[PDB]
Nucleic acid binder design. Sequence first.
RNA 1: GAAAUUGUUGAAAGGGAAGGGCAUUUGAUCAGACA
RNA 2: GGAAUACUGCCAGCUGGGACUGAGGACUGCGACGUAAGUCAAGGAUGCUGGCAUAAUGGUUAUAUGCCGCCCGUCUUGAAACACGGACCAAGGAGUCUAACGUCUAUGCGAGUGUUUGGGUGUAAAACCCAUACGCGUAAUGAAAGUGAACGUAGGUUGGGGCCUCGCAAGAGGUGCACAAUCGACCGAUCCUGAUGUCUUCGGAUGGAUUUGAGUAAGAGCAUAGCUGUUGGGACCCGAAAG
RNA 3: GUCGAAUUUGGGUAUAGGGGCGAAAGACUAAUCGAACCAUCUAGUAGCUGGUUCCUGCCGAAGUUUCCCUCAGGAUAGCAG
RNA 4: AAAUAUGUAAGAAGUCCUUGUUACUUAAUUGAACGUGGACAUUUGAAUGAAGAGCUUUUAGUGGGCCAUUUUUGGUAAGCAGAACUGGCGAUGCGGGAUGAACCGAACGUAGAGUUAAGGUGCCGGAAUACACGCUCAUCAGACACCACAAAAGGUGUUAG
RNA 5: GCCCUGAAAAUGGAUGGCGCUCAAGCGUGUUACCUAUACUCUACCGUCAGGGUUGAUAUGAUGCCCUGACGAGUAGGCAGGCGUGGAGGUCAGUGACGAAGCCUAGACCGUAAGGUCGGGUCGAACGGCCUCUAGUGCAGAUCUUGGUGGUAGUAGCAAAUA
RNA 6: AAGGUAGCCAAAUGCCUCGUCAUCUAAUUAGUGACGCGCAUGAAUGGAUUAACGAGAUUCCCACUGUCCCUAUCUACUAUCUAGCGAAACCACAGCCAAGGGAACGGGCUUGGCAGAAUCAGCGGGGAAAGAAGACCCUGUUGAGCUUGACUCUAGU
RNA 7: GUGGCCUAUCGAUCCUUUAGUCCCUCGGAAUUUGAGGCUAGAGGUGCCAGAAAAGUUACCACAGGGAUAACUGGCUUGUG
RNA 8: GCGUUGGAUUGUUCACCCACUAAUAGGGAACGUGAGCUGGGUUUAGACCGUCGUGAGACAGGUUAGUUUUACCCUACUGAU
Lengths: 159, 99, 53, 185, 148
Amino acid sequence: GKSHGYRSRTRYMFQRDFRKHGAVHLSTYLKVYKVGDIVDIKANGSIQKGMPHKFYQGKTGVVYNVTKSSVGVIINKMVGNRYLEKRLNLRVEHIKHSKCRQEFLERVKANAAKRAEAKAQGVAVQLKRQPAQPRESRIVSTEGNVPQTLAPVPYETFI
Amino acid sequence: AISKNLPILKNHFRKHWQERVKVHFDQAGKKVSRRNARATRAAKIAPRPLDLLRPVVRAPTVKYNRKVRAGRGFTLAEVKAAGLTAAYARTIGIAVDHR
Amino acid sequence: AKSKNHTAHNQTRKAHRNGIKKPKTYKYPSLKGVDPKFRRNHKHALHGTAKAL
Amino acid sequence: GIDHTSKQHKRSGHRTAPKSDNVYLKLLVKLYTFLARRTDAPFNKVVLKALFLSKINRPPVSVSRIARALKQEGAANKTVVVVGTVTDDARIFEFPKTTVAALRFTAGARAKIVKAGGECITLDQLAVRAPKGQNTLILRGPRNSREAVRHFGMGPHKGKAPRILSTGRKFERARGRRRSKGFKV
Amino acid sequence: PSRFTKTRKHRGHVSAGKGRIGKHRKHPGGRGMAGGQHHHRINMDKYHPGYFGKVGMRYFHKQQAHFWKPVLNLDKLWTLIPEDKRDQYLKSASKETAPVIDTLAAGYGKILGKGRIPNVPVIVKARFVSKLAEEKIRAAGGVVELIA
RNA sequence: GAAAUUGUUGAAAGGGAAGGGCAUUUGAUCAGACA
RNA sequence: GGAAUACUGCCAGCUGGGACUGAGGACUGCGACGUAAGUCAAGGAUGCUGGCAUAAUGGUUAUAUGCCGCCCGUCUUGAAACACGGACCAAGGAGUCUAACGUCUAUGCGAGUGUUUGGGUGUAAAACCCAUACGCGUAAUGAAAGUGAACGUAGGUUGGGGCCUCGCAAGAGGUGCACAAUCGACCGAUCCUGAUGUCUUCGGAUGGAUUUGAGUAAGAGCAUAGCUGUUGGGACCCGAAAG
RNA sequence: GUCGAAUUUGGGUAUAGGGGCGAAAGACUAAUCGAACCAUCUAGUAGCUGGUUCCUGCCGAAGUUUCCCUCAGGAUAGCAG
RNA sequence: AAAUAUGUAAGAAGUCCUUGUUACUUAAUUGAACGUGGACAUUUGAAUGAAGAGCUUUUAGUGGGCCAUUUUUGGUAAGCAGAACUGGCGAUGCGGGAUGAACCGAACGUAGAGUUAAGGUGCCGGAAUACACGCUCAUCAGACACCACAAAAGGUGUUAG
RNA sequence: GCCCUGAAAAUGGAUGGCGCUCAAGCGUGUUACCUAUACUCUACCGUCAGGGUUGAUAUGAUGCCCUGACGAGUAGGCAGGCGUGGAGGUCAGUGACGAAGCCUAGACCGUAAGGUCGGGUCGAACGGCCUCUAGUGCAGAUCUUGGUGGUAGUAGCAAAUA
RNA sequence: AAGGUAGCCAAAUGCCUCGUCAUCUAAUUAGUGACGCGCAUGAAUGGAUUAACGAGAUUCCCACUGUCCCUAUCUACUAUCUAGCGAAACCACAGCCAAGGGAACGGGCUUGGCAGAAUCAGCGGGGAAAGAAGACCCUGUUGAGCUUGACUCUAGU
RNA sequence: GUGGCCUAUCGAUCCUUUAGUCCCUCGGAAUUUGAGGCUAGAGGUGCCAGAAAAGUUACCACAGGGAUAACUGGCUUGUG
RNA sequence: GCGUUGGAUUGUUCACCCACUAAUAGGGAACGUGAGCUGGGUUUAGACCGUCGUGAGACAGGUUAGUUUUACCCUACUGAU
Ligand SMILES: [Cl-]
Ligand SMILES: [Cl-]
Ligand SMILES: [Cl-]
Ligand SMILES: [Cl-]
Ligand SMILES: [Cl-]
Ligand SMILES: [Cl-]
Ligand SMILES: [Cl-]
Ligand SMILES: [Cl-]
Ligand SMILES: [Mg+2]
Ligand SMILES: [Mg+2]
Ligand SMILES: [Mg+2]
Ligand SMILES: [Mg+2]
Ligand SMILES: [Mg+2]
Ligand SMILES: [Mg+2]
Ligand SMILES: [Mg+2]
Ligand SMILES: [Mg+2]
Ligand SMILES: [Mg+2]
Ligand SMILES: [Mg+2]
Ligand SMILES: [Mg+2]
Ligand SMILES: [Mg+2]
Ligand SMILES: [Mg+2]
Ligand SMILES: [Mg+2]
Ligand SMILES: [Mg+2]
Ligand SMILES: [Mg+2]
Ligand SMILES: [Mg+2]
Ligand SMILES: [Mg+2]
Ligand SMILES: [Mg+2]
Ligand SMILES: [Mg+2]
Ligand SMILES: [Mg+2]
Ligand SMILES: [Mg+2]
Ligand SMILES: [Mg+2]
Ligand SMILES: [Mg+2]
Ligand SMILES: [Mg+2]
Ligand SMILES: [Mg+2]
Ligand SMILES: [Mg+2]
Ligand SMILES: [Mg+2]
Ligand SMILES: [Mg+2]
Ligand SMILES: [Mg+2]
Ligand SMILES: [Mg+2]
Ligand SMILES: [Mg+2]
Ligand SMILES: [Mg+2]
Ligand SMILES: [Mg+2]
Ligand SMILES: [Mg+2]
Ligand SMILES: [Mg+2]
Ligand SMILES: [Mg+2]
Ligand SMILES: [Mg+2]
Ligand SMILES: [Mg+2]
Ligand SMILES: [Mg+2]
Ligand SMILES: [Mg+2]
Ligand SMILES: [Mg+2]
Ligand SMILES: [Mg+2]
Ligand SMILES: [Mg+2]
Ligand SMILES: [Mg+2]
Ligand SMILES: [Mg+2]
Ligand SMILES: [Mg+2]
Ligand SMILES: [Mg+2]
Ligand SMILES: [Mg+2]
Ligand SMILES: [Mg+2]
Ligand SMILES: [Mg+2]
Ligand SMILES: [Mg+2]
Ligand SMILES: [Mg+2]
Ligand SMILES: [Mg+2]
Ligand SMILES: [Mg+2]
Ligand SMILES: [Mg+2]
Ligand SMILES: [Mg+2]
């Protein structure tokens, strides 16, 4: 019959990296997680306790609870035609801080600095990002760069 | 035959209930006949009040013992204390209860 | 007689008629599953600051 | 052909007129339709829409609720407006001297307001006194205290009231409600 | 009335609203509460938890009159006094002239204390009373008399 | 004294069915305004 | 060395022929042309003229011609089917009523509500009037013995229509019902703590607990009527082999 | 085929429905027999076949999930008003 | 170690400063959580769109499906059996493929005028027996997707390389 | 590349047919032209949405009016209407000087369910509007009862000597 | 428990099988006589053999013949026509083909062939002709007859 | 450290029985046996969301099914 | 284009022999053809044997006996007005 065990189809997902087996480095256990931090989930195959289910591999959530060796993460899961909130009790070895927003905090700091320096001098602070714009006009010189003519090559075998 | 969120029903109609349906179409008719019966009885019986005198008794049970109502009849001791016999009282319009 | 066993055809189209709705977010979320010792002390911290204010 | 992003010929889903055939209620709707069109006062639009509500959407407002609202800071001399029925409440022993405008007053509610020195007026009298809702206070009754609401959303771990006829020991307290009988919800 | 039913609208539509495929048969699924544990289990486990099984202990020949005891809260206590006399007693809060309330005569068994009563002495006669209800009556200067 | 069905008389069409839709010709028949 | 032309593009350049359409019905607008009066192609057609005034136009009907058109109803992934019922016509012919209920809506009264079991009365199965009860609601929670809902402006926080103050406005401040999320308090159950006192085993004050309830926290219900839905009944109509 | 006999036949009489009768075919028991006919229970039940009667307007599907002696059926979620 | 699909973030429920509560935590007012008070407005934190957003009750029918492109399992194969994504038929007429449930175009209130789609313009049949450069002669030529079939191997037939 | 050999099936036969050979065939390029319930503009009907208008003295504020967009549909849902038997109210309604019914390739109104009129036949009752009520609408069910066809002046009306 | 004895046989009992040999014929899956490791013969579930008898099942021979080579002719009564009398089955609408596509075998649809009133006697190609809600097969939480240490009972004893 | 390094190794109602609390009830009032409740386990349903169940019909029956087999026809051509 | 046979055994299609012959080729037409026939076979109910089953009964094993209905209609065809 069919098999739908807890760790089914996880042959490669939970493997260690090549030449990266063994004990976990100490910086994993020294990081500090607080309620409200954004973390991403990546199960470590050598730690069988506090291991997330395979569905949450590669998912990002928000910490809501902090315990002795584990944290609680909030995950929104799409079930049917709606999203339901899932609460996971995961050990710290299976998570890490998310860099998707640490850079955003830098832009928040930079916006305030540019907002303040323009507060006394210039109107229209212009603190909004823009997408890539079409290129402006330019002049290309041929001094030492005379164009060289190219032609299609004939067919050859060279086997 | 169970569907949706509905209360459980207990309708007792698994017998030949349609053979024993009693509709009181004659409710108005019986009221007229009862009034006719009381009128004919009063004119026939005597100038007496058409009903016997009843005593006052305490209702039983802790739920109703706070009220008094009309009982069956006066006791033998109550009748004797009033100054007449039970045999004579029954013929004069007084209900007598011996128990 | 035999019949079809399983298919997910037309299921996504049904889900997009009224569904695919993100959850509504609330401030002051539920404290269910939070450490009981933290909640026990957090209750006393709120009582004290209410008296002060 | 047009690729439609939404349903066509869709009604607004809000009542534009009362469902009742009360001739006197229609007169009030006609009065406040005129006012809402030619006053640009937010009060008149609220009152007009409230006249379209059904019975369950207009819960009764007791006099005790009126007295509590008058205890608000700066609301002692405001006119209480209830689009519905004002009922009596004997649990309170002191009542202010306010003015109350409502569609209907019960016998107890009207007597209690008048005995305290106040007055009970209709909605058309309110319009003459306050055409733009000056110094008014709108009070609405509680909708979720209705008996039907407690059965809505029934299901596991929802904590709702089951739809049952007879309540007692032998009525839906067995397996499914306690751990000693199979499981608990 | 029959002229407002959907039967009049279904005239000339073959299936009369019951569908062509499923049809309207006699008793698909059984009669009454049939299949409550086999093919109607889901609709019974939800919407009706606790239906199957027995819980308590039996009571042979139960009489409901033994358990008659209507409850009255203190916030409704003054309603038992007629309205024409409430005003004088409220404004004449004093001893030696405390109104007497016979709760049993009004059809109640036990006095419960939920609301707040005026600070007026009242004599309350009842069969049963809760501990909190008695305290609030005495705090206003009243007394509780036990009757039977 | 209805229909199915039938007789007579009158009109019309008909080269292996008949019946129908849009448009106009031909025949028959008919209402409206003469302000 | 100097032009022309082709190709591509622009013109708030000019101008001829043909077809379809005329919606609206006092005035109001925006412009143009003029010193001005006024005029105009400027928020939708007017002017001039002829024939006929009846079967002439048109309607109806039969027929002809051009093109198109397979037999309806039904089950079905799929019917014109070599799938089933139907020769023709008239009349009859299939979701009804009842008991108990869910949602919604209308009406009366409202912490109450229900006159019609019965009584009174009558122009007599109608209409009119009425006592006491009873039903439901106003208290819940436990298997039960039982106990029984305010620390506080009937709590705090966040969002809230409307109203109030100021302001030309925008906005700011104040108050914030209903409703939504959350933290507390109160009542019952469960597990603990066990005060003053005692028929020395009774009594259970006080203070708690990732526990539990269809609760409290200025009541909302009762009655009647209607569509729709549910169950028992012959139960939308007709149909077994049987017992 | 048989034709003096285990022969053919009239009338009388006996055996009645889970019973009869059978030189035995499940044959016969009033054109009815691997359980007669008649009335009633009875409008017996049917997840199965057929049918289900006026017009216009607006919106508009599903053959997929879990459970069921569930596989021509229901409950449940979804889609629809 | 791709491509395509896939999680989160792009602010007022935010950032910054100062200091209030606690029985939790720390050697320690240390930290954690929740707050008081002050400052920062909508180029207030990318793009485009938004027949308005949010929410609740109740109930119908359905729970036999099938087809096409791409991915793909069993099978020699099948108009065979079974899955994945999307679009369709069923529930749908209309123009085209002679004819056809699914292909192409395009989806439909009643009319008038104009322009087109896919497909076509010798005649049937509305529209060039149009223009231009080549190729092909078959005693079983050929003629338009889905589609209604043809192969290996050959020819001093003819054409170009 | 094109053509040919390789290349055999049963009724007569199908580039759709005729037919077509510097094509009306094959590959490719450039223009003109034909026509869908699609697109553009206009009218009309309906639906939905956003608005204007109570002022008396002239009738519908569920009225009237302005603006924009939209229109496929089985199973199924909802809404507005048409028709039938009977009931309360009203039109002091119609009628032996002809009610009801029936016939009528005669007329008018409505998108439709239907409504109205004329003519013929006929002989005693019947209708509009506001409401109440249901044994209220048929093309089918090898439907029920009754009536009637094509088949068809057909099969046939020939054992038992006349 | 005993291992088929006396007998009998490709037998109405033998799968292989049209078994092998002999006989019968020009030619024999037939018939008969033998042979027997007999799938799976056998002794009152009776074995073997039997004169007579049989509308019983088979093979051959003689006579006989229209069974046939190979058909022909004659009689009566029909059919046929007339006078009188006068039904039924069946019927969605109907009735010419070829190919195509289509629910994969068309009277209708598409493209072609074609196509002239009204009819009589024959005829069995077609109308997937008519006669019956398939008796075969499967499905249904539909039956009945019969059987048995199926489940549960019961008269009797 | 709240069993086996991780991914499988298992079971409702009714009834019986055990453990706990020695608590609640037997409804005219009490004591002692007995019985019934409260909380947590065990006895098992493997068709494992869990009816208690042997055949035969060639004497056969009914409701249906081309959702499904025994002929043609169609697709396919391994095999021939 | 024109022909492709007569027989023994078998219900047989198939197969195998005898013989003649110029030759005794292979196939289709709803595995052509039952309102054209025939009914030997298969495939209802009777009966027998062998093997199997406790039994009722089973056997694509053998054996014997077992109802073959209707054309007058349309078209097609053959002739005839
Ligand atoms: Cl599908
Ligand atoms: Cl409707
Ligand atoms: Cl024509
Ligand atoms: Cl308790
Ligand atoms: Cl008898
Ligand atoms: Cl009409
Ligand atoms: Cl002839
Ligand atoms: Cl057997
Ligand atoms: Mg419909
Ligand atoms: Mg039907
Ligand atoms: Mg159904
Ligand atoms: Mg007559
Ligand atoms: Mg006639
Ligand atoms: Mg004309
Ligand atoms: Mg045609
Ligand atoms: Mg089929
Ligand atoms: Mg059809
Ligand atoms: Mg059928
Ligand atoms: Mg028929
Ligand atoms: Mg009728
Ligand atoms: Mg019956
Ligand atoms: Mg039985
Ligand atoms: Mg005899
Ligand atoms: Mg037999
Ligand atoms: Mg019936
Ligand atoms: Mg639509
Ligand atoms: Mg089961
Ligand atoms: Mg079916
Ligand atoms: Mg089905
Ligand atoms: Mg269907
Ligand atoms: Mg084609
Ligand atoms: Mg042309
Ligand atoms: Mg070309
Ligand atoms: Mg539509
Ligand atoms: Mg008349
Ligand atoms: Mg006529
Ligand atoms: Mg007369
Ligand atoms: Mg009827
Ligand atoms: Mg009829
Ligand atoms: Mg019909
Ligand atoms: Mg019939
Ligand atoms: Mg004849
Ligand atoms: Mg004869
Ligand atoms: Mg004779
Ligand atoms: Mg022999
Ligand atoms: Mg032998
Ligand atoms: Mg022996
Ligand atoms: Mg043909
Ligand atoms: Mg036919
Ligand atoms: Mg033709
Ligand atoms: Mg059948
Ligand atoms: Mg049958
Ligand atoms: Mg089943
Ligand atoms: Mg049985
Ligand atoms: Mg170990
Ligand atoms: Mg472990
Ligand atoms: Mg007792
Ligand atoms: Mg199961
Ligand atoms: Mg099939
Ligand atoms: Mg081969
Ligand atoms: Mg054949
Ligand atoms: Mg035959
Ligand atoms: Mg034949
Ligand atoms: Mg035979
Ligand atoms: Mg037999």
